[PDB]
Design a protein around this ligand. Structure first.
Ligand SMILES: *[C@@H]1O[C@H](CO)[C@@H](O[C@@H]2O[C@H](CO)[C@@H](O[C@@H]3O[C@H](CO)[C@@H](O)[C@H](O)[C@@H]3O)[C@H](O)[C@H]2NC(C)=O)[C@H](O)[C@H]1NC(C)=O
Ligand SMILES: *[C@@H]1O[C@H](CO)[C@@H](O)[C@H](O)[C@H]1NC(C)=O
Ligand SMILES: *[C@@H]1O[C@H](CO)[C@@H](O)[C@H](O)[C@H]1NC(C)=O
Ligand SMILES: *[C@@H]1O[C@H](CO)[C@@H](O)[C@H](O)[C@H]1NC(C)=O
Ligand SMILES: *[C@@H]1O[C@H](CO)[C@@H](O)[C@H](O)[C@H]1NC(C)=O
Ligand SMILES: *[C@@H]1O[C@H](CO)[C@@H](O)[C@H](O)[C@H]1NC(C)=O
Ligand SMILES: *[C@@H]1O[C@H](CO)[C@@H](O)[C@H](O)[C@H]1NC(C)=O
Ligand SMILES: *[C@@H]1O[C@H](CO)[C@@H](O)[C@H](O)[C@H]1NC(C)=O
Ligand SMILES: *[C@@H]1O[C@H](CO)[C@@H](O)[C@H](O)[C@H]1NC(C)=O
Ligand SMILES: *[C@@H]1O[C@H](CO)[C@@H](O)[C@H](O)[C@H]1NC(C)=O
Ligand SMILES: *[C@@H]1O[C@H](CO)[C@@H](O)[C@H](O)[C@H]1NC(C)=O
Ligand SMILES: *[C@@H]1O[C@H](CO)[C@@H](O)[C@H](O)[C@H]1NC(C)=O
Ligand SMILES: *[C@@H]1O[C@H](CO)[C@@H](O)[C@H](O)[C@H]1NC(C)=O
Ligand SMILES: *[C@@H]1O[C@H](CO)[C@@H](O)[C@H](O)[C@H]1NC(C)=O
Ligand SMILES: N[C@@H](CCC(=O)O)C(=O)O
Ligand SMILES: N[C@@H](CCC(=O)O)C(=O)O
Ligand SMILES: [Cl-]
Ligand code: NA
Lengths: 219, 217, 427, 453
């Protein structure tokens, strides 16, 4: 399998700079252009530029000249994008993407392989761990919930009973208020099976090294 | 820079039916005997997947119900028949000329029969109360279409302030939406009032759906 | 006198091909009159280079002191017809005993081409008779179990193909035509090329084996109907000239031509009229190595079958300025053998234990562990009998008919090929 | 047949007025050690002894002249086979090979060469022999490289070129509507040419070649084999063309059985009837094996001849060599010619020998009664070659016709390996450029006994 493995989400201060890595595996690294693509939340895709890992030649979209710097490290099969002098306008998901095979030129090549993406958050705000509150309540189905409040930055993960409850699960998109995100999650289970069968909300916020289990205790 | 204009912006197509997405380019994207226009699918929270390259070549691993055609400056992506996991944003992309540019995207929604939301309201947890804040959460689960109106009433008065809303993406199985509505108060504020009401309005019904509790119970 | 034969205490065979003739049906088992066929000037220069090398070593009182080196040299315009000369080197008293466990020669220099080498090498390998090729670049000759007495002083096609891929990746074009000679040299290049580009952005858009009545009109017809701009021409001097000359003729324009070192230093094509028209010619080339005293030797020199040159009336200038490629390889080949001899005899710095029984397989053991300097290069071979010396460079045919160096191939660097792009003037 | 009792007991050397040279892969490696007996090679050599014993017994074929021969082991190794080649070229009178520029008046000890069997071996001596214009008639070397008479002046074949075998393979693949296949070859002339010719033709016919691999024949092939196999799984092909010499093929399927791979395997003639592959434990689990072999007659007299012979050898037993241990051959050893891979290729050997003999008969102006021959006649190979060019001859019940390349008008039988019997069934043929199979005769070794896909 060709895999592009990008580095984790970053929170960075305004004015500072940051470096994203893309580790390529399972093909010959120097034979294909590595492209970089930006996606603001609004969700337009923008091409930043590409690098020829064979010799280090780069091509940039004009608006990123002297904003982004692409480099490669051939001995570890890794591509890097350094973002300079960051502003809130640089908060986005960044992708590395490999040229495929078949285009007449390096210009005409399309993108067949993508890394998972790297979320960049440009803020002077401070890392906060979440508060996790249980949402306890009669019909055939009973809806339980979990409130993950006041954390920063993104992301958190929410699973129910370690992954065993998957059906009837809704995790809602976080909402940002005073430099703090709030999200929640609901899970619908058979009423016969609660509270007798314990339902537990698993929340993890790796930015703050927070991992919390909250049992949905009845009222 | 070649500008790509997709139409429509968004689209709702029933299961088993045909979806047609268009891309028009400001200049021709033809060269070397080809049209350098490609199509990508992006599900929410995931990298784009290449569906079709050079206007009409299906990439390996992609079902034959995706197809593309056109040339010069006018291109069409076609999905027939639409299946439930096809909701996504579809982006066209030209690579005829530096810099590469993407279209603004077309948002494909699965159309289904209308469905009423299932509503559940939750008073603040004891745990949150201990902390000097109070949140009243209302889930509106598994409804369609996405347009819905929620209002909050406290002791018989509508409350605008402190309400945050949030929608899920379309569900890959039943093609419905869900929504959470959170009313954040100070603990003092919460303890000052008695009844809290979550009130949903949706096109499946002329009656609103209301869930309530009284604090002092 | 004969240029082809020099008496001495020990003999090196010299396998060359001074004339060119296409393959043709024959009905009699006999040598070809090569001397009436088309003279090849740069081959003749390589021929002289070996004669110069032996004379320099005989002039020396430290390499093989008081032990003279002689030679039997041949002009084999045809591989299938070269066996009489081969039998002479291997024979004991003009006789070959098939089942034998002192041959006329102790080693041989050449031949120049993969085809010549494939046809004859088995006869040499059977008794570990040292062949040191100055030009045969076939990949198969790195397989030591098949050719265990075969050494060479030029690099394998693998390397040259790498260099050629390096050039392509350094620029933006990714569709490639690959025109190759319909023989073992060419065919082997095509497989090395296909292998190297399988895992890359480079796509082999078109390839054709090139021979005698290749309809070049129709090759170039498809090449431009597939809009290919880059054309690799991997072929010997004769086939390459056919391709390029047809190109001018058929007014093929705006192409990027890529040459291997067999024709990147061609002296005919860059001066050819209309050459400018076909676009831009780059290539992998051997850097010009200066062999001191060779000019003087040539001035002084211009004054059994396949041992006749039939080439009086030669412009000494035209020989001097001929394609100097493979010069150091020939030079080193002869010296590699002389050093081996020297070390087998256990010579000192001024004397050699005299009249000793030397066996070609002893020369092989000393050949393989060659390690000596020569014009400030170090002559060594790896376990495959391939050379650990010699650079490749990138050239660009510039507006005044010169093959201007614009880059280097580095065998063991991170950026394998480097090119000063600004030197290239694009037609 | 009364002439079975007049025959001599020398296997690898028969005295004669005119003499054929023989080259056979009789003993291989597991200077160099040739210790492993190749029963097929030994088998095919016996066929040459039979053919020559029979020609000689026939008063009407070469009436005045006794035909003799010298057979040597090739060991399928370049260093081994060169010495016997040179020895065929020594002057008949002397035993030595003289060094001349002109050999037109030079009478070689052998007048023509039978063998070698493998294409790798022809590329070793083919141009040596071609320079002398010594006719060489291979009974097994199938590479299309030798079809060029400007490169191989005196080469003939009693088996078809592989340019046709791959055509037959590609046509069978199209007939079954498979257009996504992998091809695997052994890493020498036969395999390399096979893989190239296939790939090329699969393009011409719109078959996409998902992968090509080469099994090494020198040193450990296991690493290369694990790579190949990994690409086969990865591409998820279900049809694999295996263009390979027997030993790497064995190395190959040993790994294919370890990893429980299943599918359709297309066999080239070299291993399509190899007992060494079909006797592997659990080979019957790899699925369906379809193969192409030469359309040959069966020599009905081979087994009766060989038991009489192996009886006469045993009697004379108490009295170097290409096969030292052949001294102790008994009637117990007659299975060497009853093995199906000898039985079904014997005619190729037989037709080679008879081809030279008829050509000789025509050269020497023979009729049923006498020849223009005597102990002062000087036979030059180049003269014999002149006769063999575009030769026609009936041999038993076959109209053998060589074209200007040296290729015969011989086609293919298509076979399937039937695991329950450990047998081979006939499912069709390939004559000219027309594959002709009956899909109904095919057995599909799959879960529901139906054609894959
Ligand atoms: C290579 O050797 C062959 C065989 O000897 C040479 O051919 C022989 O050449 C002579 C011609 O010089 C022929 O002998 C003479 O024949 C002519 C009539 O053809 C006759 O008028 C003369 O009085 C004399 O007897 C002989 O027939 C011929 N043998 C052949 C052609 O088979 C051949 O010329 C040699 N090639 C060389 C030296 O390049
Ligand atoms: C030298 O070559 C020419 C042909 O280029 C030929 O006409 C002439 O006879 C030759 N001289 C010889 C072979 O002595
Ligand atoms: C060798 O020495 C002679 C004089 O003995 C001289 O004329 C000749 O140029 C020298 N040749 C070389 C160095 O190749
Ligand atoms: C070189 O050695 C030979 C013996 O092979 C001898 O005749 C001669 O005198 C020596 N040359 C000298 C000593 O200059
Ligand atoms: C140049 O060559 C092309 C293709 O070979 C041909 O179509 C064209 O007519 C030529 N142009 C000329 C002769 O001006
Ligand atoms: C090669 O020679 C040099 C000195 O001439 C020596 O330093 C080096 O060790 C040698 N390499 C070997 C023997 O492998
Ligand atoms: C062409 O290159 C040659 C050799 O490098 C050099 O002498 C000459 O200056 C160049 N001519 C140009 C650049 O026009
Ligand atoms: C590259 O080429 C130009 C033009 O010949 C030359 O002026 C310059 O020195 C070169 N740049 C280098 C060697 O860094
Ligand atoms: C063959 O064998 C018979 C019976 O022993 C014998 O009489 C005869 O001489 C032999 N015939 C030959 C050798 O032609
Ligand atoms: C695959 O091969 C292994 C050999 O270790 C065997 O144990 C296993 O049962 C096989 N699996 C199959 C045939 O599905
Ligand atoms: C002949 O047969 C015997 C036993 O049947 C066996 O030991 C011997 O190897 C055989 N010889 C061959 C096959 O050459
Ligand atoms: C073979 O037999 C056929 C049919 O009778 C005949 O036409 C042909 O002449 C024969 N060929 C020979 C005897 O070479
Ligand atoms: C098995 O038996 C015989 C030969 O042993 C054969 O005719 C028959 O076709 C075979 N059975 C099959 C192929 O099912
Ligand atoms: C094909 O074989 C089947 C027997 O399985 C039979 O229906 C038919 O006769 C055969 N067709 C031929 C030989 O053309
Ligand atoms: N390298 C070539 C010979 C020299 C050339 O033509 O480039 C060969 O092995 O045949
Ligand atoms: N036909 C194969 C030889 C097959 C074998 O020797 O098993 C070849 O051309 O080399
Ligand atoms: Cl053989
Ligand atoms: Na000396």
């Amino acid at each position: 399998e060709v895999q592009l493995q990008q580095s984790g989400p970053e929170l960075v201060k305004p004015g500072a700079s940051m470096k994203i890595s893309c580790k390529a595996s399972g093909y010959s690294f120097t034979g294909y252009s590595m492209n970089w693509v930006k996606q603001s939340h609004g969700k337009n895709l923008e091409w930043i530029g590409l690098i020829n890992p064979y010799n280090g030649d780069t091509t940039y979209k004009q608006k990123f000249k002297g904003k982004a710097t692409l480099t490669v490290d051939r001995s570890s099969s890794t591509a890097y994008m350094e973002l300079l002098r960051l502003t809130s306008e640089d908060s986005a998901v960044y992708y590395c993407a490999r040229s495929g095979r078949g285009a007449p030129t390096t210009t005409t090549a399309w993108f067949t392989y993508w890394g998972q993406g790297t979320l960049v958050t440009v803020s002077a705000a401070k890392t906060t761990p979440p508060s996790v509150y249980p949402l306890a309540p009669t019909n055939s189905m009973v809806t339980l919930g979990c409130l993950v409040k006041g954390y920063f930055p993104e992301p958190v993960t929410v699973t129910w009973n370690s992954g065993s409850l998957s059906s009837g699960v809704h995790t809602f998109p976080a909402v940002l208020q005073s430099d703090l995100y709030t999200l929640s999650s609901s899970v619908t289970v058979p009423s016969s099976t609660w509270p007798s069968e314990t339902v537990t909300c698993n929340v993890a916020h790796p930015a703050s090294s927070t991992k919390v289990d909250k049992k949905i205790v009845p009222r | 820079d070649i500008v790509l204009t997709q139409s429509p912006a968004s689209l709702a197509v029933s299961l088993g039916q045909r979806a047609t997405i268009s891309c028009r380019a400001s200049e021709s994207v033809d060269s070397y005997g080809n049209s350098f226009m490609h199509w990508y699918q992006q599900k929410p929270g995931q990298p784009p997947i290449l569906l079709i390259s050079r206007a009409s070549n299906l990439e390996s691993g992609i079902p034959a119900r995706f197809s593309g055609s056109g040339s010069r400056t006018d291109f069409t992506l076609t999905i027939n028949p639409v299946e439930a996991d096809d909701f996504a944003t579809y982006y066209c992309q030209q690579t005829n000329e530096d810099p590469r540019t993407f279209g603004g995207g077309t948002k494909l929604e699965i159309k289904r029969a209308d469905a009423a939301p299932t509503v559940s309201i939750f008073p603040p947890s004891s745990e949150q109360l201990t902390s000097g804040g109070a949140s009243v959460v209302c889930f509106l689960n598994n409804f369609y279409p996405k347009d819905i109106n929620v209002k909050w009433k406290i002791d018989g008065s509508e409350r605008q302030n402190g309400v945050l809303n949030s929608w899920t993406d379309q569900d890959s199985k039943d093609s419905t939406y869900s929504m959470s509505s959170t009313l954040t108060l100070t603990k003092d504020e919460y303890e000052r009032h008695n009844s809290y009401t979550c009130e949903a309005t949706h096109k499946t019904s002329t009656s609103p759906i209301v869930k309530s509790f009284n604090r002092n119970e | 006198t004969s240029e082809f034969h020099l008496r001495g205490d020990y003999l090196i065979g010299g396998l060359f091909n001074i004339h060119y003739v296409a393959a043709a049906n024959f009905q009699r088992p006999q040598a070809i009159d090569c001397s009436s066929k088309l003279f090849i000037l740069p081959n003749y220069r390589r021929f002289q280079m070996m004669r110069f090398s032996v004379e320099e070593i005989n002039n020396s009182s430290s390499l093989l002191p008081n032990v003279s080196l002689g030679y039997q040299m041949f002009d084999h315009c045809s591989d299938i017809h070269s066996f009489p000369g081969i039998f002479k080197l291997l024979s004991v008293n003009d006789l070959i005993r098939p089942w034998e466990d002192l041959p006329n020669a102790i080693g041989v220099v050449g031949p120049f081409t993969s085809t010549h080498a494939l046809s004859i090498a088995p006869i040499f390998m059977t008794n570990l008779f040292p062949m040191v090729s100055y030009g045969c670049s076939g990949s198969v000759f790195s397989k030591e179990n098949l050719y265990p007495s075969f050494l060479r002083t030029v690099h394998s096609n693998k390397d040259v193909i790498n260099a050629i891929v390096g050039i392509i990746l350094n620029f933006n074009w990714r569709w490639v035509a690959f025109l190759y000679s319909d023989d073992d040299f060419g065919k082997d290049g095509l497989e090395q090329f296909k292998n190297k580009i399988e895992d890359s952005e480079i796509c082999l858009a078109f390839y054709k084996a090139i021979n005698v009545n290749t309809d070049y009109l129709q090759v170039f017809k498809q090449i431009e109907e597939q809009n290919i701009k880059v054309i690799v021409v991997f072929a010997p001097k004769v086939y390459a000239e056919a391709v390029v000359e047809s190109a001018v003729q058929l007014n093929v324009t705006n192409k990027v031509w890529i040459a291997d070192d067999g024709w990147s230093l061609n002296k005919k094509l860059p001066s050819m009229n209309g050459i400018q028209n076909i676009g831009t010619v780059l290539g992998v080339a051997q850097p010009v190595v200066t062999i001191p005293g060779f000019t003087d030797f040539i001035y002084s020199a211009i004054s059994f079958c396949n041992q006749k040159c039939n080439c009086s009336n030669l412009s000494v200038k035209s020989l001097l300025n001929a394609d100097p490629s493979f010069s150091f390889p020939v030079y080193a080949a002869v010296y590699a053998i002389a050093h081996a001899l020297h070390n087998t005899l256990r010579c000192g710095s001024d004397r050699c234990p005299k009249n000793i029984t030397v066996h070609p397989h002893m020369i092989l053991e000393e050949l393989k562990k060659s390690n000596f300097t020569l014009l400030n290069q170090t002559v060594q071979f790896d376990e495959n009998g391939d050379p650990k010396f010699g650079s490749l460079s990138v050239v660009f045919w510039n507006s005044s008919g010169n093959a201007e160096e614009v880059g280097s191939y580095h065998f063991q660097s991170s950026i394998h090929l480097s090119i000063n792009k600004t030197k290239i003037k694009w037609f | 047949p009364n002439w079975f009792n007049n025959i001599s007991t020398d296997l690898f050397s028969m005295p004669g007025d005119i003499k054929l040279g023989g080259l056979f892969p009789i003993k291989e490696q597991s200077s160099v050690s040739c210790d492993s007996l190749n029963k097929d090679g030994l088998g095919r050599a016996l066929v040459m002894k039979y053919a020559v014993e029979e020609i000689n017994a026939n008063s009407q074929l070469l009436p005045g002249v006794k035909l003799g021969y010298k057979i040597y082991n090739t060991c399928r190794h370049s260093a081994v086979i060169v010495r016997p080649a040179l020895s065929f070229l020594t002057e008949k009178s002397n035993g030595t090979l003289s060094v001349e520029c002109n050999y037109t008046d030079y009478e070689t000890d052998m007048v023509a060469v039978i063998g070698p069997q493998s294409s790798e071996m022809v590329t070793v001596i083919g141009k040596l022999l071609g320079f002398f214009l010594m006719p060489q008639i291979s009974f097994g070397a199938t590479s299309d490289k030798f079809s060029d008479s400007l490169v191989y002046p005196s080469f003939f074949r009693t088996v078809p070129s592989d340019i046709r075998q791959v055509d037959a393979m590609v046509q069978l693949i199209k007939k079954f509507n498979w257009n996504w296949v992998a091809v695997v070859g052994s890493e020498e002339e036969y395999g390399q040419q096979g893989v190239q010719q296939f790939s090329k033709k699969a393009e011409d016919m719109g078959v996409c070649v998902a992968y090509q691999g080469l099994i090494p024949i020198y040193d450990d092939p296991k690493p290369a084999i694990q790579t190949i196999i990994n690409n086969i799984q990865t591409t998820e092909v279900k049809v694999v063309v295996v263009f390979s010499l027997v030993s790497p093929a064995v190395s190959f399927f040993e790994e294919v059985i370890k990893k429980n791979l299943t599918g359709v395997w297309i066999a080239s003639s070299s291993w399509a009837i190899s007992d060494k592959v079909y006797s592997l434990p659990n080979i019957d689990s790899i699925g369906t094996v379809i193969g192409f072999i030469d359309e040959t007659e069966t020599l009905e007299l081979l087994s009766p001849f060989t038991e009489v012979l192996f009886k006469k050898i045993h009697e004379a037993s108490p009295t170097y060599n290409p096969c030292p241990e052949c001294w102790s051959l008994s009637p117990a050893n007659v299975s060497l010619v009853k093995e199906e891979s000898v039985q079904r290729t014997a005619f190729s050997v037989y037709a080679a020998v008879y081809t030279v003999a008829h050509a000789l008969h025509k050269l020497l102006e023979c009729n049923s009664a006498a020849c223009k021959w005597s102990s002062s006649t000087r036979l030059y190979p180049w003269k014999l070659l002149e006769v063999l060019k575009e030769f026609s001859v009936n041999i038993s019940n076959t109209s053998l016709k060589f074209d200007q390349n040296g290729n015969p008008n011989i086609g293919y039988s298509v076979i399937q390996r039937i695991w329950e019997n450990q047998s081979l069934s006939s499912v069709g043929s390939y004559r000219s450029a027309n594959l002709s199979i009956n899909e109904t005769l095919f057995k599909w070794y799959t879960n529901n006994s139906e054609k894959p896909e």
